[PDB]
Amino acid sequence: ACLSFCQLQKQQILLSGYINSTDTSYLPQCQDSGDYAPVQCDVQQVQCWCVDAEGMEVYGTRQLGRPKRCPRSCEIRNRRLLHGVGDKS
């Protein structure tokens, strides 16, 4: 058994808040499968946003606490197309 990309980052943020001892107000909340949960925020749970399954934050969906639904991989690509990053189809 080895460690998923979530729990790589959740240890790397937390000991950086322990070696440097400066706290960072974000730690991921991935599920049993290892990949990220779609909704992501910190312990205070004031701004919970939807995230891509690879890890990068989906730009625009920073709600104030709870997304009812998260965009999936088509609707992100279908809307960024309509903003205009190439490939008009």
């Binding site: 939807c50 989906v58 730009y59 625009g60 969906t61 920073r62 965009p71 809307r79 903003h83």
Partner: protein
């Protein structure tokens, strides 16, 4: 409840068996025998600590009881009420400033109209010193961030509830051009509340900066041009200015 400029004789006292009525009877009679007061202020902070500070030629009078005062903020940028409610188990100590900027029931309240007029250094107590001549590379550039409105579009109701911040701008300091320039620069300082800034003259002492949201209601018909709808204000102003919309890329919502 605030002046931002001009405060004479802060007679700081309290009631301990008397009441705040006689405090109003106290400092009203102080303004019947000189020229160096045009109004006064009457405060209270959680009981007891009251102020009768007298007003000699204020620049503005800002932050009405009937405005919009919930940006969810206190004690840090709370220059609009003037009070800074602190929590080092402070709870007792009265403290006063220079614009009734109190460091602590809240009944702050103010009076007006001595029908003033004076002479330079004759009966002279408060003069409007350091008038801040703004640079035209900064003052002349904010006037193109906004846009005038043809006043045929706005109609009056006087009856639709429309939240708004209000100001006085007395004519002895602010000129006709500086009446706009303070009110338009005040509209920039409220980054999301101001869309309509107006200047009106209902009596001959002052100007009036009244900041509005976008008061452009529109009917239910689905037509292209916006000619079928217009503005509604409680009174018809002399001038009117729009904070023109600055849309930015990288949209902040997933519609």
């Amino acid at each position: 409840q605030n002046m931002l400029s001009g405060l004479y004789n802060p007679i700081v006292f309290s009631a301990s068996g008397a009441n705040l009525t006689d405090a109003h009877l106290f400092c009203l009679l102080a303004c019947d025998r000189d020229l160096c007061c045009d109004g006064f202020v009457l405060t209270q902070v959680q009981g007891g600590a009251i102020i009768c500070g007298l007003l000699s030629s204020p620049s503005v009078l800002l932050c009405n009881v009937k405005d919009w005062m919930d940006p969810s903020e206190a004690w840090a940028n709370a220059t609009c009420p003037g009070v800074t409610y602190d929590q080092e188990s402070h709870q007792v100590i009265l403290r006063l400033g220079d614009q009734e900027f109190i460091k602590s029931f809240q009944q702050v309240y103010l009076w007006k109209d001595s029908d003033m007029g004076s002479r330079p250094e004759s009966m002279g107590c408060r003069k409007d010193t350091v008038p801040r001549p703004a640079s035209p590379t900064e003052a002349g550039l904010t006037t193109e961030l906004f846009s005038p409105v043809d006043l045929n579009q706005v109609i009056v109701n006087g009856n639709q509830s429309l939240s708004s911040q209000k100001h006085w701008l007395f004519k002895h300091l602010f000129s006709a051009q500086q009446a706009n320039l303070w009110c338009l620069s005040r509209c920039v300082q409220e980054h999301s509340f101001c869309q309509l800034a107006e200047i009106t003259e209902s009596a001959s002492l002052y100007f009036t900066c009244t900041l509005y949201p976008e008061a452009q209601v529109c009917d239910d018909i689905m037509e292209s041009n916006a000619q079928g709808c217009r503005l509604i204000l409680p009174q018809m102003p002399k001038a009117l200015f729009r904070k023109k919309v600055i849309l930015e890329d990288k949209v902040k919502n997933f519609y």
